């Protein structure tokens, strides 16, 4: 008895190049025992000759071709199944081209093979239970090898008689076992399905080694629309693109799932090709067959049993992987691993989640439950179930979260709810923008999408400003998000012109809403709230989109353009893009590549305040653009009851003006209909000393609405040629001739008095101060007053008051002391009994040379000698500075090439126990030297003075080096810049501390 267990990825192999096979006449016989529906029994031959005899899905297939056309036979399963694990016969007659295929004995079928060929002839290779590449021998309908034991195999010829069972186990050298090996049956089999229960579960696998041709086989089940199945790319090309040469491309081919639809992805060089695999959405829940075959630019892909053909552009035939294939996902952040664009579930981070069974590649049989199963891989369990159970009844998104039912758990779509997390239970961070705060984004690497999920959520009171931008170092392509005229408007700009789209209306209303988008290739789609979703097709065939940053606030990088939208003032919250949360992840240090000044938390907002220090104080700015509609905002704050706020005047009558006139808001205008009157609902005078909100627009159907703090007044006024003012826009007032002679229903008499905040311009932010043409009276930064400036007391130590826009600050370099105004102790070391040292080091290249010095130190003291700090040049060079007391008086010593130069304090008594303060100036040789408040003392040496204190190495401090060891307190030392006590106290790396010396300390 002649039985053998074919492992799988085992098979026989027979050369008759020595004595070729070439009949008009033959027989084969075999008994199998298989539990799989698909494999090789045995295939001989090339070209058109040959002879293959396999399982395809449950039935015994033979194909014949004698040169001439084959004769192909799939004999049924009558009374039960083939893959039953039990043996059954196989007999194959052939007389000239006709041929009778037996099962078991007695399950006939006969045919001819075509035309008029009649001899079979082969001299290369006789395989038997698999092949190195099984797709590929000619005939062959299967694309698998065997698993399962085979039996008693022989093919007889009218000449020979290749007993194939027989010398396999006899051993022959004509018989090469390729692989495995095993002899014996009563053998069993089965291989685990797997189940992905995260999309960031992934497995990784044996290198596809494919070349001109290859094949892979999978089942899957799922019912999440979108995932990541298969991938793997090549090493990277030379020939480059010439718009994103930044952009890395490879060789890759993928299948991936979107929307339920499921697809293949293709590269080997030129062009990709993306087919839709079936028409129907596969998220089913139900399993599926996924047979991938492929022969250079050609193959197919087959979702069970349905092929649909491909062929890919250009000429490259080989796709040359190299290295690892991925299934089920991508690892993130691995090093080498680069993210076509084509394939867009990578790109938005969409896992596969669901099952996975019965692995081939190239025909050879693949163990999931095993491959990093058995190694350690989150996310992937065992077998693969099915929970009944709906997961949206546990209920289990708060906050008004969309419960999605996946696979085997529960999905949560928590954007527009002020949550994120699994399940809506983390508190989303907000932002806040005041016209002048940024947030960005820099990507660690440069990215490259033609795809993107975005969602954010806004509130604002102005009608304009950006609400996101993708931005590129080297160019300005751009995706974006921003205010247009209370609208929301998305643009795509690739280079070819800006596609947009439009949602919403009136969204100013400082309520949050929530924008997402998803731009899918061409296809534009933008949402807001839950309103009906916004879709555009991009026009130019550009898709792929670069970027280097995401801002929101301002757009910062802009280096190709001449203007931009104008900056944001409101909040944002769950900016989220490919479902990276980035606000939250800055907030909470996940991430270190965002940078930003816009400050986090909810608060209202009073964007560069400014004010009006006189009713006669005024800016004029450039003329309002009021082309086809207008959107004013602006806040105000008062003590008065009457005053111009803003006035331009146009041609002819034109003009608009808004006034406070008895503590009531007027918007007073005229656009060719005569002058009207609109006023703004309020029950009280508005100069009550706080800030009211301001929002006048018009819209292009001349629809006007002034909105006062919480209250919306709308008046419709005639339809008008809307044309452009001509005057400049004047703020705060008019010159003072001017009111005698202003418009019809104007009453002012008298500008404003007050401050003025966010004031927005039709789309434009203006600084009321710097951006004026001119400007009449005072007009001061802030509503708090000015500045505090320096007095005589201001700082408190000798410090020095120096004046900065906002306020003094003091300088206290020079004093012992810290804090604000010189008034808190300086960082304080205590030198006991013993001795002690803390040693400032350089390090070895940034060894300053200087030729002007500062120090200044505190100290106490009863001793009458020591050195208290010492700055020494390295090894071989003499240069240095003392600073000791000697004989009960401070001084310093130092050298800087030419001969020592010693200063002395002579007078003052500071071996005492009080607090002393020295400080030591040095230009080159001169020098001076003040204890306290005692005169300065100068010092002028004559002759060739050398004047640089070369490549300084160290600062030694506590005088045990130079045999002289000071015991006290040092307090807030200062020597050129470095604040050397401070550093130690905060354990920099290069302070060496030793023997007896404390820290001090505060209150
Ligand atoms: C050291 O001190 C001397 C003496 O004051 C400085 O030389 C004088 O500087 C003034 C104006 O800055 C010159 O106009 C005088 O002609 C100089 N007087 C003499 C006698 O030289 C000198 O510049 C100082 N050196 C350093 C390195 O600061």
Known sequence: EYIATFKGSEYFCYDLSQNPIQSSSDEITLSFKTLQRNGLMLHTGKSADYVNLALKNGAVSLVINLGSGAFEALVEPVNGKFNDNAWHDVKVTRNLRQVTISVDGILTTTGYTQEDYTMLGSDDFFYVGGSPSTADLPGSPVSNNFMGCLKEVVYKNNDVRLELSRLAKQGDPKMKIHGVVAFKCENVATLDPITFETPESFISLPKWNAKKTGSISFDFRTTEPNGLILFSHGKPRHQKDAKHPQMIKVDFFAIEMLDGHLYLLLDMGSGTIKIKALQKKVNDGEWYHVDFQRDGRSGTISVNTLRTPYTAPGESEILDLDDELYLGGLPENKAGLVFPTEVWTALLNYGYVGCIRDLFIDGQSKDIRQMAEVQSTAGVKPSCSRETAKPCLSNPCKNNGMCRDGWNRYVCDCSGTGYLGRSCEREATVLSYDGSMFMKIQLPVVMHTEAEDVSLRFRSQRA????????????????????????????????????????????????????????????????????????????????????????????????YLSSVPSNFIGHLQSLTFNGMAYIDLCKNGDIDYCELNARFGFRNI?????????????????????????????????????????????????????????????????????????????????????????????????????????????????????????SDLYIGGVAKETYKSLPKLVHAKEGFQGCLASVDLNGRLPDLISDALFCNGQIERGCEGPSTTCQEDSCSNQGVCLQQWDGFSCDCSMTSFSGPLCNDPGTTYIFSK??????????????????????????????????????????????????????????????????????????????????????????????????????????????????????????????????????????????????????????????????????????
């Open 464 to 559: 304009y400003g950006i609400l996101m931008a993708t931005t590129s170092r080297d160019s300005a392509d751009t995706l974006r998000l921003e205010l247009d005229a209370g609208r929301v408007k998305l643009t795509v700009n690739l280079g070819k012109g800006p596609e947009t789209l439009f949602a919403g209306y009136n969204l100013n209303d400082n309520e949050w809403h929530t924008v997402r988008v998803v731009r899918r290739g061409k296809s534009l789609k933008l949402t807001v709230d839950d309103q009906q979703a916004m879709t555009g097709q991009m026009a130019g065939d550009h898709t792929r989109l670069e970027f280097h940053n995401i801002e929101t606030g301002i757009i910062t990088e802009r280096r």
């Open 606 to 726: 009073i964007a560069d305040p400014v004010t009006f220090k006189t009713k006669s104080s005024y800016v004029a700015l450039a003329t309002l653009q009021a082309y086809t509609s207008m959107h004013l905002f602006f806040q105000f704050k008062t003590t008065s009851l009457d005053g111009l706020i803003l006035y331009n005047s146009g041609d002819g009558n034109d003009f608009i003006v808004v006034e406070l006139v008895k503590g009531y808001l007027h918007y007073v205008f005229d656009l060719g209909n005569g002058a009207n009157l609109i006023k703004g609902s309020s029950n009280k005078p508005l100069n009550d000393n706080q800030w009211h909100n301001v929002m006048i627009s018009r819209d292009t159907s001349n629809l006007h609405t002034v909105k006062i703090d919480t209250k919306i007044t709308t008046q419709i006024t005639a339809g008008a040629r809307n044309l452009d003012l001509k």
């Open 834 to 1003: 013993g001795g002690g040292q803390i040693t400032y080091k350089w390090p070895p290249n940034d060894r300053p040379s200087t030729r002007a010095d500062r120090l200044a130190i505190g100290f106490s003291t009863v001793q009458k000698e020591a050195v208290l700090v010492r700055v020494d040049s390295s090894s071989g060079l003499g240069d240095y500075l003392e600073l000791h007391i000697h004989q009960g008086k401070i001084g310093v010593k130092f050298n800087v090439g030419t001969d020592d130069i010693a200063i002395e304090e002579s007078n003052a008594i500071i071996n005492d126990g009080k607090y002393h303060v020295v400080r030591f100036t040095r230009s080159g040789g001169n020098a001076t030297l003040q204890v306290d408040s005692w005169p300065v003392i100068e010092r002028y040496p004559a002759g060739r003075q050398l004047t640089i204190f070369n490549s300084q190495a160290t600062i030694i401090i506590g005088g045990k080096e130079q045999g002289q060891p000071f015991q006290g307190q040092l307090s807030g030392l200062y020597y050129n810049g470095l604040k050397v006590l401070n550093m130690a106290a905060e354990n920099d790396a290069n302070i060496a501390i030793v023997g007896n010396v404390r820290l001090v300390g505060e209150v």
